[PDB]
Amino acid sequence: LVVN
Amino acid sequence: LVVN
Amino acid sequence: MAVLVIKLIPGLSGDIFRAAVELGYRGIVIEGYGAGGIPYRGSDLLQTIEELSKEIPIVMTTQAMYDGVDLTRYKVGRLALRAGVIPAGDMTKEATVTKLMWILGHTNNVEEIKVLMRKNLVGELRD
Amino acid sequence: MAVLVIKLIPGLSGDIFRAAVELGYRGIVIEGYGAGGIPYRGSDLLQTIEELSKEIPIVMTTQAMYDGVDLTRYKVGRLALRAGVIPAGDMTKEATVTKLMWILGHTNNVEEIKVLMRKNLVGELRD
Amino acid sequence: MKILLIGMGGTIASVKGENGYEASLSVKEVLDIAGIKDCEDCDFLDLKNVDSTLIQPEDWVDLAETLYKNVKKYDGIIVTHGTDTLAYTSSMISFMLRNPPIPIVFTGSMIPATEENSDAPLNLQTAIKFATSGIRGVYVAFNGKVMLGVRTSKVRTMSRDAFESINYPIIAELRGEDLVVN
Amino acid sequence: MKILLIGMGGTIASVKGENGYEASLSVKEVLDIAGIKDCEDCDFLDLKNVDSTLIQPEDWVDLAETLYKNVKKYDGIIVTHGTDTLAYTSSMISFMLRNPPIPIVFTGSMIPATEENSDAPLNLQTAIKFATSGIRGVYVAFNGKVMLGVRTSKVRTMSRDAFESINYPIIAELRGEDLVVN
Ligand SMILES: [Cl-]
Ligand SMILES: [Cl-]
Ligand SMILES: [Cl-]
Ligand SMILES: [Cl-]
């Protein structure tokens, strides 16, 4: 959150 | 050994 | 010869791991929270380790005193394995680091270091 | 905000601590062997820390689970204090690091951080 | 009397699917599956649903804000959480909320509530009893024991007895139906 | 029968002077001050006299070489050492000397042998009994317990019970005058  |  | 041991804490970046490698460290131990795993949520750490674990052995232990790691237990753990992290199984922290240092005195082949770290050499590890 | 936790192992150099500072880390925790102390024999670590502890807080905990640190107990410990190291007393590792991070959110004055770290804020520390 | 339960996710709320995907249950669902029938006048709030290894400092700010907004409305608060960073979260919250007017109790479980022989019902029941004690502060309840949140460490990776109070007495310990001081 | 004691220094060998200077005793002097009378046919060799916090990897190479030169001449070897890095030294030596033909026992004490109520006599007596057991390997003897050297960690900074065997059974434990298996 954020993951990529 | 060696210390300074 | 030179190993660096870093404790995983919330918000830890991959930048120190890259600095370590540039300094010439030949191995890294990451002391994780429990059974193991590397943060990827709002963290560049998993991405960094995935990149570096091809260059040098990156070993995972746990901050907990007992039961050791198992990267197969949880999803975050399984991700760490895929990223190329070497689990320390049930080894003590002292055995993990001295074992790595000892191996590094013989080889620098990461895949070779990997199989040695997972092999019970003298009673330190359940393999 | 950014803290780095490094475990003391035989042969650890000061070079990673300098790299940490250059990267912008605002605090360092060094997890020592027992009651506390920084190697100076065939090691540049004490010299390095003596230099850096004026710039950022450098806190000492212990790898041992119980009883915490006491830098007054042994000669190597007393040297660490003179070098400007902040003891963590009997705090848990988790409390030590979160406390430091919390303080760093308020100040960057090392002497101020020093007195806060030694003060029992919420029951984490015997002061 | 009046208790809020806040969900953060963790093993306690885990369900496993046909393939390698896990998913997280809401905190009310966890409590219902755990078989807690004694929790009426309990509100439920889901804040996060993450494995605690993924916990980041931003999450502590969110939790602290939510806690601050609710301390005056409830008599006790319980936060369910993954075990990996439970002691980090409980420690940071202790520093952020210096004078909580109520018990704030962190808990979780090593075995999902949806699994056989879960530790979830014991820990939730322990947390609920302490949440009604009138003892102000930030605590961790696990394996029948209540520990000061800022004196707790995870000690085992593969056991129900996952935590200990470090250099400090256990606050209380469940015996029968009673929490017994120390 | 035939035992070598190798000194590395540490708290066990510490004497304190009028001012803040400490100094280290030789291993034979330690054993004599500890009151060990049962150790005849014991040789003594002083390798280092350092606080174990100062231990460096070079020291392990020196120790390993000295051990290698003496394993065939003695029936058991005891190494006295500071507690801070005892488990590191005992672990690295285990990797360097993979098949020792004799018991090699690491020990030390939290209270100097020259002080009142020292743990030194217990640990030396434990080490000596194990050194005569005929059980090959690298071990650590402390607070009446013998642990595999590569499974030992320092667990307390301010107690006589400073070490534990981690995820592995204790090798033996002194009861009365007997080392009892586990
Ligand atoms: Cl280096
Ligand atoms: Cl950074
Ligand atoms: Cl209230
Ligand atoms: Cl022999």
Author numbering:
A (entry chain D), B (entry chain D): 4841 to 4844
C (entry chain B), D (entry chain B): 200 to 326
E (entry chain A), F (entry chain A): 1 to 182
Manuscript excerpt for this entry:
The interactions of P2 with dcPfA forced us to speculate that either this might be non-specific binding or probably another site involved in establishing contact between protein molecules. We thus attempted co-crystallization of cPfA with peptide to further investigate this observation. We successfully co-crystallized cPfA and peptide and the refined structure proved that the P2 retained its binding site thus the interaction was specific. All these interactions were located in a single zone between adjacent protein molecules. This result solved the riddle regarding binding of peptide (P2) at the same site in both peptide-bound dcPfA and cPfA structures.
Variable temperature solution light scattering and/or SAXS experiments have provided important findings about influence of temperature on protein shape or association levels which expand our understanding. Previously, we provided a detailed structural and mechanistic insight of thermophilic l-asparaginase from Pyrococcus furiosus in its full-length (PfA), and a conjoined functional version (cPfA) (domain architecture shown in Supplementary Fig. S1). SAXS and crystal diffraction data analysis brought forth that despite lacking a 19-residue long linker which connects the two domains, namely the N- and C-halves (N-PfA and C-PfA, respectively), cPfA adopts a solution shape and crystalline state that is comparable to wild type full-length protein PfA with improved specific-activity. In conclusion, the findings reported here provide structural evidence in support of temperature induced higher order oligomer formation conferring stability to thermophilic proteins thereby regulating their functioning.
